[PDB]
Symmetry: C5
Subunit: 310 residues, 5 copies
């Protein structure tokens, strides 16, 4: 009959989230309890009731006694894992207690940036058993798994945490146990509000303020400068995300500004051409409509973006 | 007679592709099966039918029994390889099973950027045997080799995967076995369409829109600004590729814009000089041709680029 | 009865403080004294009164004698720790002396940027015992703990240093000892004064100097350029801090400049519109008020910022 | 009498050349053959005629037999060297065969940038014996040393490869053997032609095109803008090279453009001052000379640079 | 009585100097000679007169014989040290010879940037003995210490090198030996002359050239542009140094230019205001003084900077 293995995992720190590379790094602790009757012993007088071992000596003892150990792996681990503590404790009845402290990076293949920056994401860590379920079975340790209090993350806010068990067939035809830890997070909007939304609205407001001078050439020149400013803003924004194959809300928002600036340039050019041919009265008649059509275009664009994306 | 060695390799993650340095990094697993009759044993009562070893103990046992092992290497490996699991399993008949999990970077010397960004590339991993074929022979393990489902790559799309066997003579006069895994990939165009093509066309469209004002000096000034804008665009684009010895489609596309801007400047200067000498009627007569010659030049340039490159 | 463990920690160098990632790196030394009567020995003639061991041999000796050692860990350690010296000295009465030299990075979750750049911060290092207090108890070594003289930090100035003891329940239901070292630091203002405050004031002063020309259009153009300059300054400043969820004094200072520039643009546009309709006398009458209202707005904004934040 | 040591070294990949730091990184293989009669043995029946060892076991065997080994070092190695394979093979007559695969970075102190970008450089790798020549002597292995075919370098082209032997006195009064591998390389000019030469010539051509409008103020403004453009180009160029103590051809080329722009500004200012005083006829008379003196200055500057540097 | 330990240290390469982080990295070699009569032996026939050991075997032998070894450390070492060779040689009389090759980074807390870029700096490496002087004493090995010939540094020039001995009390109440190696270096000025001094002087010269047009508004506009250019130059310069708490010569030089530009703007505004009120004769009378006061201000500023700093 297969033997039971109890698994527990806790996350202490979140050292960083890299959305450009779609990965994250944490500092955590692992606890495992496993009982093997063949490791039972009787303590001599003057000796402690529990024995302490290093990992190498414990492995050598297991090899000498020819006992199979439950090898496992981190399925979505990336790069090198730095170990701080690896301790072994053995009781008289054969129960083995193991502790592991580490820092490592893990893959996050569930990213979706369609609703950026109003998006919510999922992160997980998978622990897989190598041997099939007819030799070892995973069980959930009680009272240890979860997330810490001083995570240190400034931008992301955790919403929920869950754990469960499942199976896999990575290396054997038969099923093997898998342990899963998951959590969800969302984003703060203060940085985006302070750095992106306000400057664009201020530039648009000043450009519309300048329209009361009734200077078509000056309007054309200002719109031409604002087009380059918007292009620079788009190029700056594009550097924070991977080269995705789909269009996002921010990109649509910038393209709308591009289109509106182009339309304003065309209208001002037409008004100047009308003025140049002695139709100043017609230009003055159409100027009120030209001025009043400016904010409604942006309002309609915002409404259209909301309808399309939400 | 030589002994048979079965080889299998699977790729789980693609952590990144660096076209500037022409290399890529993956996370994969290696499986090898090899049978040696001299390692046969009989299990004692109460002991498992299979024995588990660490790598060092297995190597020490092989050295004590004086048995040659099939050493191999990754031919195109670059840098340090980080190992996560290295496990050994031995059966009673002498069959050895080996598992290896790693993360590493590999060279990609087959890059070709002539059709960038409409290019398709090839990637491969080579496994080479050190000893000649009269001692060991490689064989293909069935049902293990291939690529995973959750690769995590956002820009590249895999098209096909193949494996085969060949030979090499790196260290011996005689032939030695080689195992090859290959795949092809292409590129998404959404990022390029959103970031490069649209702004240039919009700038050209606005510059041609401004031509209806009939202001030669303003046309000259706008063209002069657009030349600097195009130079900045070219400098920004050049940073994503190595310093190649051949010209690409994007570079030709930018040079065409340079040439067209220069021609527009020359034409506007000639028109202004004609106007300054009392030939305003001649300038107005030629203005229609000057305006109508603008988009045909770009159309002819696009056609010429298509003819030259495709 | 539990045995006493004496702990001492000293910091020699501060190699860097990364406020963007909220961590710091140091070079330090650790000293521990622990007495075990079971390790007593008698020296043979011709041999020294003290014995020197490497860490591995000492651990092997402890395992052979089956003696539990007081395992510990750095709670807020991040990444890999590089060890330079790990020495063991044993006396005849069983007293063990241990020395450890290392370089490592530690988490700083107590950062607060609300008063930046007039802020004061706290840094700490935690040492935790794994076994509960009924087996081992931590004690404070005298005359060793503190900070060095040649720290090498150029921007931060240390104000005070303290040490104390506390408890934790990370791995056991019972309490376990904890050792804490803390210090506070503040910031130099010369860099900020030379790089930020002076250029903005100079630009504002030159913009107000230009007001005596009585040219509304030139004022509008200069204000439009200064708005872009201020936007560039804000974008440059934002890169030195994490994407915080709250507003800081520098951000408020930049937003005030944005608002004042917008108001100046609006006022100049209104004056130009008044002049265009034959109300030049009214514009000249209001010009004195328009000129005199410029510095009072900045003075009131500075006063309001001081009231809000201090 | 000293024993002979045969040395061979081959380079498989060139992973990068860093001219800013003056170093390069490669992937290579090392082969050594050495015969020691004290290691002779007789094979038992059923055992192979050659024995395979790991490095640690071979070193332990040598220490047990008390045999000195020929220690060596890479003289110009920088940083850590990553080893992939380290294999030992021993024959019955005592001949030892060694293989080593590595990736590492090496110093390049022979750089000279005076003729940049028309320069040719030298690279080398030095292998030094620690013990003097009265104990060991190096010999050249035949048929192994050289460079591979798939180097992967895109910018540099190899011209020749050579090997030889010499001596050194790094650690002993007597001479010790040294093995040297050298090669030369030159640079591709397509990148420089496409990115540097064409834009500058186009800007100069457009600036000279604008001279036919007969507008001194516009000429002054255009020259003032081009001066800033050239300054930006110089600052961009300077980042690709170390802070050298001597002047290069590119720097002289940029300084010539600076000087010519300054002279053009001075001439245009003088012409405008002449026009302002009623000397428009004199200004028109001198305008032909002013226009015709523009390209001859650049031609003379190019000739002078060629004379000075070549 | 204490035993004598001979120490020698040589530096082969200088791989880089980081003034922003105030550290430097080198490649060097260490040689130590120490005699212990308890390690004497007699060679058997057929064996060499000297024995070769690895570090681990030598340490195990010392532990078996229970002999204290002179442990040492690099006091100002930062980060991980990469070892290439660690060799042990023992003679029949008990003399031990040790060799160590390494690459590492060291702290430089003696930096002073007040006279930048005309500054001269000091660098040192400290080797400290752990045990007090009543057990071991350091001595200076003759003919080994110093610096190499092919250092590879391009910007810094070494002026002198010295060695000496001193004491410390880092870990014991009694004194312990210390070995010190020091050298001084200065900076090349070609890079600064070519990149900083020339462009600023050229811009100032062109701005003063433009003054002969007698256009106050154009002077104001040019000065306004040059102010932004100088601000950009200051921001670019500030990135090469740490955020120091004191003002440097370059910063004072840039602030002087700021002040002079502001004064020029004020003077031009006053002249324009005088002209606008029918005082063109007064403006023309004061124009000669305004023109002649330009270079004397810069000359006086340079003299004042020289007086203040030198
Ligand atoms: C770190 N990875 C595991 C990802 C890579 C492999 O690491 P190694 O191959 O170096 O070591 C394997 C360690 C081990 F698995 F053998 C073991 F000792 F930890 C144990 F599992 F056997 C155990 F006994 F400790 C226990 F935890 F299962 C028990 F019994 F305590 F519950
Ligand atoms: C990681 N590289 C290989 C690139 C560098 C060298 O690595 P090492 O020299 O450290 O170890 C060599 C390991 C090994 F080759 F000896 C072996 F143990 F893995 C084995 F091949 F012999 C085997 F027995 F395991 C097996 F796989 F062939 C079998 F029999 F199971 F099929
Ligand atoms: C480096 N971390 C500790 C963070 C990770 C674990 O490191 P390791 O598990 O590799 O080694 C554990 C070392 C040790 F703890 F066993 C010990 F030898 F240092 C000792 F504590 F037992 C001691 F005896 F030295 C002493 F200091 F307590 C005494 F007695 F001298 F006071
Ligand atoms: C990697 N560096 C060498 C730069 C640093 C030192 O490396 P290590 O000190 O760790 O190992 C030393 C290895 C060695 F030198 F002892 C040896 F085993 F390789 C051998 F030279 F003795 C040999 F026997 F293999 C042989 F090659 F000379 C022969 F006989 F085969 F020809
Ligand atoms: C690298 N650091 C030293 C910075 C960290 C510690 O390194 P380790 O603790 O790993 O090794 C300690 C090495 C050593 F010190 F024991 C020794 F073997 F090198 C020796 F000093 F004893 C000696 F014998 F070699 C000798 F040099 F003194 C002599 F006798 F030859 F002169
Ligand atoms: C409140 C934050 C909004 C951000 C829109 C880009
Ligand atoms: C077409 C979308 C425009 C959005 C502007 C807020
Ligand atoms: C809740 C998000 C609304 C976004 C509107 C563009
Ligand atoms: C559809 C993508 C086209 C990109 C051309 C540069
Ligand atoms: C000469 C090529 C021009 C291409 C413009 C689209
Ligand atoms: C299919 C690619 C077409 C490119 C035309 C320039
Ligand atoms: C004295 C320094 C003040 C900095 C204000 C931003
Ligand atoms: C509203 C705050 C303005 C601050 C300007 C100094
Ligand atoms: C002491 C800090 C004052 C800040 C005023 C804005
Ligand atoms: C043909 C390349 C010339 C480069 C001159 C800078
Ligand atoms: C004085 C050198 C000028 C070179 C211009 C091509
Ligand atoms: C062959 C190089 C010529 C360079 C002329 C400036
Ligand atoms: C000769 C170099 C002078 C540098 C002044 C900044
Ligand atoms: C006040 C210092 C000015 C220096 C200009 C060279
Ligand atoms: C010798 C340095 C002189 C510097 C004058 C500003």
């Amino acid at each position: 009959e297969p033997s039971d293995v109890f698994i527990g995992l806790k996350i202490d720190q979140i050292t960083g989230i890299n959305q450009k590379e779609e990965n994250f790094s944490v500092v955590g602790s692992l606890r495992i309890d496993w009982r093997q009757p063949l490791l039972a012993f009787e303590h001599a007088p003057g000796e402690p009731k529990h024995r302490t071992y290093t990992l190498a000596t414990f492995l050598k003892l297991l090899e000498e006694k020819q006992i199979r150990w439950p090898a496992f792996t981190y399925h979505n681990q990336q790069g090198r894992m730095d170990f701080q503590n690896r301790l072994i404790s053995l009781s008289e009845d054969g129960t083995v207690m193991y502790l592991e402290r580490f820092t490592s990076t893990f893959q996050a293949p569930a990213f979706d940036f369609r609703l950026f920056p109003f998006d919510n994401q999922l992160f997980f860590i998978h622990v897989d058993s190598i041997f099939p379920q007819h030799l070892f079975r995973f069980q959930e340790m009680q009272g240890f798994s979860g997330l810490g209090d001083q995570l240190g993350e400034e931008e992301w806010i955790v919403t929920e945490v869950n754990t469960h068990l499942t199976t896999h067939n990575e290396f054997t035809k038969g099923d093997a146990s898998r342990f899963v830890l998951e959590f969800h997070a969302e984003r703060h909007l203060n940085y985006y509000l302070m750095r992106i939304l306000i400057p664009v609205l201020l530039i648009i407001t000043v450009s519309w303020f300048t329209f009361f001078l009734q200077d078509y050439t000056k309007r054309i020149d200002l719109a031409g400068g604002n087009l380059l400013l918007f292009i620079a803003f788009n190029f700056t924004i594009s550097s924070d995300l991977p080269r995705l194959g789909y269009i996002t809300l921010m990109d649509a928002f910038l393209v709308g500004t591009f289109i509106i600036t182009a339309l304003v340039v065309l209208g001002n050019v037409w008004l100047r051409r009308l003025e140049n041919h002695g139709k100043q009265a017609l230009a003055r008649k159409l100027d009120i409509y030209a001025i009043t059509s400016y904010p409604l275009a942006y309002l309609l664009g915002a409404l259209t973006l909301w309808l399309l994306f939400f």
